[PDB]
Design a binder for this molecule. Sequence first.
Ligand SMILES: O=S(=O)(O)CCCN1CCN(CCO)CC1
Length: 170
Amino acid sequence: GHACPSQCSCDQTTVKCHSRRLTSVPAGIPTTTKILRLYSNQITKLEPGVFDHLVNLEKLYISWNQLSALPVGVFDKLTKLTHLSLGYNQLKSVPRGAFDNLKSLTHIWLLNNPWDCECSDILYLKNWIVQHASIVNLQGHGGVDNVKCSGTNTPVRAVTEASTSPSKCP
Ligand SMILES: O=S(=O)(O)CCCN1CCN(CCO)CC1
């Protein structure tokens, strides 16, 4: 069954693509998928729309990669998502409104990214983690104060807008 990507193992609605030295999200993840494990790989980029067919997805683990950014709208179709891990990546910000369609989210992991607290792109993440602090970095991952600024390890929630500039941005 090539409904299952050759690089992953598919246990009904649970797709195991983790710990497989992958450099991109495999194409053809089955639309039945409720749990997608993509953690512990060599992914640096997500293609725009890569998850859009996974309308049933409840858990998305993409921690322990080298993701340098998120495309605009990449989570917008995942309206059933309860769990999202982005920990242990190379993210400097997330696009404005990245989480806004994730109305069912109960758990997010954002620790151990080089969040760029000098750049105004940080402000959506800062406001969002203050608003949704109770779901951030749960299960012994250090909570909302473990979303930390690159270089200083100051909690992102402590960043004042007056500390940021659009001109210190990529
Ligand atoms: O993915 S991270 O390492 O950033 C955070 C780990 C999150 N895991 C918590 C425990 N569950 C399993 C037990 O509930 C899997 C996800």
